[PDB]
């Protein structure tokens, strides 16, 4: 795997494959919204995406509110965007449906 943070090209290019997600304004970041039917749905996601944080030990910023979860994804070590994020995105996409 690729560590390395990418290009802001490189960025846009990866966010065609990944439903949701946009560049956050003004940062080296990516972000989803994502609005599940009620707050058991939501948790549900936070818990099959609390795994797959630990398994790659990369951690989300990300907020819920009932069935709302907004997600932030970004890598500290590499102060941008990498394979990671992009990896992240993709598993909560498909958790989410």
């Given at each position: 795997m690729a560590r390395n943070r990418l290009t802001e090209s490189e960025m846009n290019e990866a966010l065609?494959?990944?439903?949701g997600w946009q560049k956050v304004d003004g940062r080296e970041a990516i972000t989803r919204s994502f609005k599940f039917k009620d707050f058991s749905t939501a948790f549900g996601f936070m818990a099959q995406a609390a795994l797959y944080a630990e398994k790659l030990d990369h951690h989300p910023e990300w907020f819920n509110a009932y069935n709302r979860v907004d997600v932030t994804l970004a890598t500290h070590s590499e102060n941008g965007v990498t394979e990671l994020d992009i990896k992240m995105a993709r598993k909560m996409n498909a958790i989410a449906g």
């Open positions: 065609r494959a990944l439903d």
